[PDB]
Amino acid sequence: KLEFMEMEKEFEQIDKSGSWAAIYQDIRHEASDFPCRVAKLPKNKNRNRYRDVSPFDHSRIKLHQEDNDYINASLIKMEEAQRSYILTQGPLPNTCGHFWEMVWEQKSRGVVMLNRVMEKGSLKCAQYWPQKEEKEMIFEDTNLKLTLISEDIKSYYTVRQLELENLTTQETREILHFHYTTWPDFGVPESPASFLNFLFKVRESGSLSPEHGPVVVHDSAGIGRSGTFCLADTCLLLMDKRKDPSSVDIKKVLLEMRKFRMGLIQTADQLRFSYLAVIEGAKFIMGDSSVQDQWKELSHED
Ligand SMILES: [Cl-]
Ligand SMILES: [Cl-]
Ligand SMILES: [Cl-]
Ligand SMILES: [Cl-]
Ligand SMILES: [Cl-]
Ligand SMILES: [Cl-]
Ligand SMILES: [Mg+2]
Ligand SMILES: [Mg+2]
Questions:
Q1: Where, per the database record, does this protein carry Cysteine sulfinic acid (-SO2H)?
Q2: Which residue segment(s) compose the domain that 153 sits in?
């Protein structure tokens, strides 16, 4: 029979009335406000890409190595869902060593990049990983070596296998890089299918496993596209744990995530897209496995 999920009925009411902007601004109005004193210290000015996007002190990731422990990155710890994410800005030319130090120290297995290095004529992220196997990168400040092992290029995203080595202990780890290359700044994915096909690739890699440290997610500021990716993933995980779409309150989950980093989801259309992604993803969560193959085809990755 036909049965609308509660979220589908809410989506339709909002769409019909054209109230996405109002719904979104209300979330902005109710969002948490916490201090970012460390982010604002004079010595950290050059460690921040945007003066208006900073990590709260209570949830910021601290680098381990007495000199300066600051990186613009936040731990989004979703207690009910039991999954954590580190959301961070695209690293700067002087913070690529810090970025990989954070990946090492936090034991992350995957890095999710949702932007291109150049967008709208400006450099939104440093070229922080090696583009050629034979041109490995050594971060002198943090003593790490990063090598490109292989890459699988699809039409709108690429997955790279990287080797990160702590030169101090000579221990090495495989880091998976998931790079979404067709998601515009302040925009939305081409379709729920393209987005979900990508999120499922990250999921299938095992990078979100609780056995690993938190996946690192970023775009340029690390709040819009990054927020959309984590909101959709957490909502789908909550639905999955309970096998009940009705126990999922998307706006409530977003406000919970905003307790850990400011400005997650930057436009009303990103919020609308998040609903679309969760509604479509619910089909797979609730047992229609065949939809994953459908997304792969509609995504036109090949
Ligand atoms: Cl200072
Ligand atoms: Cl790029
Ligand atoms: Cl451009
Ligand atoms: Cl840069
Ligand atoms: Cl763009
Ligand atoms: Cl905001
Ligand atoms: Mg705390
Ligand atoms: Mg080696």
A1: 219
A2: 1-302
Tell me the CATH number at 15.
3.90.190.10
Overall domain count for the chain: 1
Q: Residue 292: how many CB atoms within 10 A of its CB?
A: 16
DSSP 2: -
The helix/strand/coil state of 177 is strand
- Give the 3-state DSSP-derived string for 205-239, with helices as H, strands as E and coil as C: CCCCCCCCCCEEEECCCCCCHHHHHHHHHHHHHHH
55 Cα–ligand 2 center, Å: 24
Residues whose Cβ atom is located within 5 A of ion ligand 2: 116-117
For the CA of 167, the nearest ligand = 8
For residue 116, the CA-to-ligand 3 centroid distance in Å is: 9
Q: Which residues pair with 140 in a beta bridge?
A: none
Q: Which ligand is nearest to the Cα of residue 34, counting in written order?
A: 7
* Euclidean distance between CA atoms 277 and 44, whole angstroms: 36
Distance 41 CA to ligand 1 centre (A): 4
Method by which the coordinates were obtained: X-ray
The DSSP H or E segment spanning 267 is none
Distance 94 CA to ligand 4 centre (A): 9
Q: Could you tell me the CA-to-CA distances from 196 to 58, 124, 176, 250, 274 in Å, in that order? A: 31, 24, 18, 17, 11
Distance 120 CA to ligand 5 centre (A): 5
| Alpha-carbon span 285 to 237, nearest angstrom | 8
How many angstroms separate the alpha carbon of residue 25 from the centre of ligand 6?
A: 8
Resolution to one decimal, Å: 1.6
Contact 47, 96 (CB under 8 A): no
Nearest in space to 11 (alpha carbons), one of 236, 201, 275, 285: 275
